[PDB]
Amino acid sequence: PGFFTSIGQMTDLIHTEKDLVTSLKDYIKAEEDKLEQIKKWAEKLDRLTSTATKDPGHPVNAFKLMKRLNTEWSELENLVLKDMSDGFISNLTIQRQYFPNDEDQVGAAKALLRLQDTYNLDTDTISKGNLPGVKHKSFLTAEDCFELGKVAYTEADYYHTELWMEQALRQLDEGEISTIDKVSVLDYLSYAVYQQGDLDKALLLTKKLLELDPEHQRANGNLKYFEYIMA
Amino acid sequence: PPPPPPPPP
C-alpha cells in the first residue's frame, strides 16, 4: 500500500543523515574553537595564580586582583556556559519527526531474522558482511547480535536466540570493544539452550555466568536446579 | 524439593 513510498522515504533519510553529519561536524569545530580559547585563558590564569600563591597590597596588584575576580572571572564563566550545540540540536529535533521509531527497528530486526530463517543463513556470514553483492561492507556489532538474539527470544525462537547470543560472545572473544552486559548475554543464552533440552551445556553456561556475577539470583537458582536433577 | 526450573529472563 504505502510500500513504495516507504522506499522513497529511506532514500530521503540517507541524504538527511548526511546533512546531520555535516551539522555535527560544524558543532565539533565550534566546540574545539571554544575549548582552545578556554585553554589559553586557563593557561594565563594558571601562571598568575601559581605565582601569587608561592609568595609568603600594592595598588597596582590590588587593582589587577579586584578586576580579575570581579570582572574577568565572570567573562570566563559566560564562555564556559556558552552552548555551541543549538544549531545541531535544532536540526536533529526537526529531522527526527521523520525518523523510524522503536516499532520500525523491531520490524527490521524481524525481517532480518525472517531472511535468515528462509535461506538458513549462518550468523557469522550475516554479521561479517559476507552476504553476496554487498561483500565485506556492513558489519553487525556484538550489541546488534545481542539485540537480534533478544528479538528471536521474544518470538520464542530459542534456536536463533542461541545462535545470535553465541555470535555476540564470539565477537567479544575476538576482541571487540562493547558495552553489552555479558552476564545478560549468558542469562538469555543459558535459558535458550535449556529450552532446547541440552542440560549439560546449560549447566556449563550457568557456571560461566556465576563466575562473572556470583550473586546472580536466577543463575544461582538454576545451578541448584541442575545440580538437583543432573546429580 | 529443588528450586523451580529455570524461568524465562
Short mmCIF file of C-alpha atoms in Angstrom, two decimals:
data_model
loop_
_atom_site.label_atom_id
_atom_site.label_comp_id
_atom_site.label_asym_id
_atom_site.label_seq_id
_atom_site.Cartn_x
_atom_site.Cartn_y
_atom_site.Cartn_z
CA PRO A 1 0.00 0.00 0.00
CA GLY A 2 2.39 2.67 1.21
CA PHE A 3 5.20 0.25 0.43
CA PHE A 4 6.88 2.00 -2.50
CA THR A 5 6.55 5.39 -0.85
CA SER A 6 8.47 3.92 2.10
CA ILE A 7 11.40 3.01 -0.15
CA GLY A 8 11.39 6.63 -1.27
CA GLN A 9 11.46 7.58 2.42
CA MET A 10 14.56 5.55 3.29
CA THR A 11 16.48 7.11 0.40
CA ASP A 12 15.46 10.56 1.61
CA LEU A 13 16.58 9.59 5.15
CA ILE A 14 20.03 8.54 3.92
CA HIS A 15 20.55 12.03 2.50
CA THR A 16 19.09 13.66 5.58
CA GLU A 17 21.57 11.77 7.74
CA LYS A 18 24.48 13.00 5.61
CA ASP A 19 23.26 16.57 6.35
CA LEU A 20 23.15 15.77 10.08
CA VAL A 21 26.79 14.70 9.94
CA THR A 22 27.66 17.99 8.25
CA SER A 23 25.86 19.81 11.04
CA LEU A 24 27.57 17.62 13.67
CA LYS A 25 30.97 18.47 12.17
CA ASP A 26 30.12 22.18 12.39
CA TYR A 27 29.24 21.74 16.07
CA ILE A 28 32.56 19.99 16.65
CA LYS A 29 34.55 22.85 15.09
CA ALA A 30 32.64 25.37 17.22
CA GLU A 31 33.34 23.41 20.43
CA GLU A 32 37.01 22.91 19.52
CA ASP A 33 37.38 26.64 18.99
CA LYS A 34 35.63 27.46 22.28
CA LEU A 35 37.78 24.95 24.13
CA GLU A 36 41.02 26.31 22.61
CA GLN A 37 40.05 29.77 23.84
CA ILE A 38 39.32 28.50 27.37
CA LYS A 39 42.61 26.55 27.45
CA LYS A 40 44.63 29.67 26.58
CA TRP A 41 42.67 31.59 29.24
CA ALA A 42 43.24 28.88 31.84
CA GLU A 43 46.95 28.86 30.98
CA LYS A 44 47.24 32.59 31.68
CA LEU A 45 45.33 32.26 34.95
CA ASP A 46 47.42 29.23 35.89
CA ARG A 47 50.57 31.33 35.56
CA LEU A 48 49.09 34.21 37.58
CA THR A 49 47.66 32.16 40.42
CA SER A 50 50.73 29.92 40.79
CA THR A 51 52.99 32.95 41.17
CA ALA A 52 50.65 34.68 43.63
CA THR A 53 50.38 31.66 45.95
CA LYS A 54 54.02 30.56 46.29
CA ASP A 55 54.66 34.03 47.74
CA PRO A 56 54.79 34.03 51.58
CA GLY A 57 48.51 45.23 48.94
CA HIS A 58 50.19 47.47 46.37
CA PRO A 59 47.55 49.49 44.50
CA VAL A 60 48.56 48.04 41.09
CA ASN A 61 48.28 44.41 42.31
CA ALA A 62 45.13 45.23 44.26
CA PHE A 63 43.50 46.72 41.18
CA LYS A 64 44.55 43.78 38.99
CA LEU A 65 43.22 41.29 41.57
CA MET A 66 39.87 43.07 42.17
CA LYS A 67 39.23 43.37 38.46
CA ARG A 68 40.21 39.78 37.73
CA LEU A 69 37.94 38.41 40.45
CA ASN A 70 35.03 40.76 39.90
CA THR A 71 35.13 41.10 36.12
CA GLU A 72 37.40 38.62 34.37
CA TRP A 73 36.06 35.50 36.11
CA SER A 74 32.51 36.48 35.11
CA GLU A 75 33.54 36.73 31.46
CA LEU A 76 35.27 33.34 31.71
CA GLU A 77 32.13 31.88 33.30
CA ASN A 78 29.98 33.22 30.45
CA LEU A 79 32.23 31.48 27.92
CA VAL A 80 32.24 28.15 29.80
CA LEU A 81 28.43 28.23 29.89
CA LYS A 82 28.04 29.22 26.22
CA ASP A 83 26.20 26.45 24.35
CA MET A 84 27.61 25.58 20.91
CA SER A 85 25.08 22.86 20.06
CA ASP A 86 21.87 24.84 19.35
CA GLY A 87 22.14 24.66 15.56
CA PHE A 88 22.85 20.94 15.53
CA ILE A 89 20.22 20.06 18.13
CA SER A 90 17.59 22.23 16.40
CA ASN A 91 18.09 20.44 13.08
CA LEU A 92 18.19 16.96 14.65
CA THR A 93 14.95 17.67 16.51
CA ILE A 94 13.20 18.77 13.31
CA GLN A 95 14.57 15.80 11.32
CA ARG A 96 13.64 13.19 13.98
CA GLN A 97 9.95 13.80 13.20
CA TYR A 98 10.52 11.70 10.07
CA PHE A 99 12.79 9.04 11.65
CA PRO A 100 11.82 5.40 12.11
CA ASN A 101 10.72 4.55 15.65
CA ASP A 102 11.11 1.59 18.05
CA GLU A 103 8.44 -0.43 16.21
CA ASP A 104 10.24 0.15 12.92
CA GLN A 105 13.54 -1.01 14.43
CA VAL A 106 11.95 -4.17 15.77
CA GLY A 107 10.23 -4.68 12.41
CA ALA A 108 13.59 -4.53 10.64
CA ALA A 109 15.17 -6.94 13.10
CA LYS A 110 12.36 -9.42 12.44
CA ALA A 111 12.76 -9.01 8.67
CA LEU A 112 16.47 -9.85 9.01
CA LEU A 113 15.62 -12.90 11.12
CA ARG A 114 12.98 -13.96 8.57
CA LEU A 115 15.57 -13.79 5.77
CA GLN A 116 17.99 -15.80 7.90
CA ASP A 117 15.41 -18.48 8.60
CA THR A 118 14.32 -18.64 4.93
CA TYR A 119 17.78 -19.16 3.48
CA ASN A 120 19.21 -20.96 6.52
CA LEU A 121 21.91 -18.31 6.78
CA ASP A 122 24.58 -18.65 9.41
CA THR A 123 25.13 -15.75 11.82
CA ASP A 124 28.81 -15.19 11.13
CA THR A 125 28.00 -14.85 7.42
CA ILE A 126 25.37 -12.21 8.20
CA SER A 127 27.44 -10.43 10.83
CA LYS A 128 30.76 -10.18 9.00
CA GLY A 129 29.32 -8.73 5.79
CA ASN A 130 29.78 -11.92 3.78
CA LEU A 131 26.38 -11.96 2.07
CA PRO A 132 26.65 -11.72 -1.77
CA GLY A 133 26.80 -8.49 -3.78
CA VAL A 134 27.48 -6.31 -0.77
CA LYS A 135 30.79 -8.07 0.02
CA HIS A 136 32.73 -7.04 3.16
CA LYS A 137 30.62 -3.91 3.74
CA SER A 138 28.06 -3.71 6.57
CA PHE A 139 29.03 -5.34 9.86
CA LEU A 140 26.91 -6.12 12.91
CA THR A 141 28.32 -5.20 16.33
CA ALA A 142 28.22 -7.51 19.36
CA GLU A 143 25.34 -5.39 20.62
CA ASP A 144 23.50 -5.76 17.28
CA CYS A 145 23.91 -9.54 17.66
CA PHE A 146 22.57 -9.44 21.23
CA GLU A 147 19.61 -7.34 20.07
CA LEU A 148 18.75 -9.76 17.26
CA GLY A 149 19.01 -12.66 19.71
CA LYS A 150 16.57 -10.92 22.03
CA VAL A 151 14.09 -10.34 19.21
CA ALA A 152 14.35 -14.05 18.39
CA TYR A 153 13.82 -14.75 22.10
CA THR A 154 10.60 -12.73 22.30
CA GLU A 155 9.25 -14.76 19.38
CA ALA A 156 10.20 -17.99 21.18
CA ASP A 157 12.77 -18.93 18.56
CA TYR A 158 15.29 -20.41 21.00
CA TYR A 159 17.33 -21.91 18.20
CA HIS A 160 18.15 -18.50 16.72
CA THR A 161 18.39 -16.94 20.17
CA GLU A 162 21.22 -19.38 20.84
CA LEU A 163 22.97 -18.68 17.52
CA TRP A 164 22.86 -14.89 17.89
CA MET A 165 23.95 -14.89 21.56
CA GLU A 166 26.90 -17.13 20.69
CA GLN A 167 27.86 -14.78 17.88
CA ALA A 168 27.78 -11.85 20.31
CA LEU A 169 30.10 -13.75 22.65
CA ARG A 170 32.48 -14.77 19.86
CA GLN A 171 32.85 -11.17 18.74
CA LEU A 172 33.75 -10.17 22.31
CA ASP A 173 36.30 -13.03 22.46
CA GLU A 174 37.77 -11.79 19.20
CA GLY A 175 38.46 -8.51 20.97
CA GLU A 176 35.51 -6.32 20.05
CA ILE A 177 35.10 -3.41 22.44
CA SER A 178 31.49 -3.22 23.54
CA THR A 179 29.25 -2.15 26.38
CA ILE A 180 26.99 -5.21 26.41
CA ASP A 181 26.41 -6.88 29.75
CA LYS A 182 27.98 -10.28 29.13
CA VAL A 183 26.14 -11.63 32.18
CA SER A 184 22.83 -10.80 30.50
CA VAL A 185 24.01 -12.45 27.28
CA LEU A 186 24.75 -15.65 29.23
CA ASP A 187 21.43 -15.30 31.07
CA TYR A 188 19.42 -15.44 27.80
CA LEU A 189 21.80 -17.93 26.19
CA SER A 190 21.66 -20.46 29.04
CA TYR A 191 17.86 -20.35 29.04
CA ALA A 192 17.64 -20.79 25.25
CA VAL A 193 19.94 -23.79 25.44
CA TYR A 194 17.98 -25.19 28.37
CA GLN A 195 14.74 -24.82 26.38
CA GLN A 196 16.10 -26.96 23.55
CA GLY A 197 16.94 -29.64 26.10
CA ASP A 198 20.74 -29.63 26.36
CA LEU A 199 21.10 -29.70 30.13
CA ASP A 200 24.87 -30.30 30.10
CA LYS A 201 25.55 -27.15 28.09
CA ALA A 202 23.03 -25.06 30.05
CA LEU A 203 24.83 -26.11 33.26
CA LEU A 204 28.17 -25.13 31.74
CA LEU A 205 26.92 -21.67 30.73
CA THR A 206 25.33 -21.17 34.16
CA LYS A 207 28.71 -21.81 35.78
CA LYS A 208 30.31 -19.32 33.38
CA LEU A 209 27.73 -16.71 34.35
CA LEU A 210 28.28 -17.25 38.09
CA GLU A 211 32.00 -16.61 37.62
CA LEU A 212 31.12 -13.12 36.43
CA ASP A 213 28.25 -12.49 38.84
CA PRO A 214 28.36 -14.79 41.89
CA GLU A 215 25.21 -13.16 43.29
CA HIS A 216 23.10 -13.57 40.14
CA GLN A 217 19.80 -14.78 41.63
CA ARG A 218 18.40 -16.53 38.59
CA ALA A 219 21.67 -18.31 37.76
CA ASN A 220 22.24 -19.44 41.36
CA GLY A 221 18.78 -20.95 41.39
CA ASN A 222 19.44 -22.58 38.02
CA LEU A 223 22.61 -24.20 39.34
CA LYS A 224 20.80 -25.68 42.35
CA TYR A 225 18.12 -26.92 39.93
CA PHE A 226 20.68 -28.53 37.60
CA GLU A 227 22.68 -29.97 40.50
CA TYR A 228 19.50 -31.46 41.94
CA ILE A 229 18.36 -33.12 38.70
CA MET A 230 21.64 -33.81 36.88
CA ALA A 231 23.06 -35.26 40.08
CA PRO B 1 12.35 -30.10 46.82
CA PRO B 2 14.66 -28.31 44.34
CA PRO B 3 14.00 -24.77 43.20
CA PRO B 4 11.54 -24.30 40.33
CA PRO B 5 13.07 -24.88 36.85
CA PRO B 6 14.93 -22.05 35.04
CA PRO B 7 12.46 -19.26 34.31
CA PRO B 8 12.50 -17.13 31.16
CA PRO B 9 14.55 -13.96 31.75
#
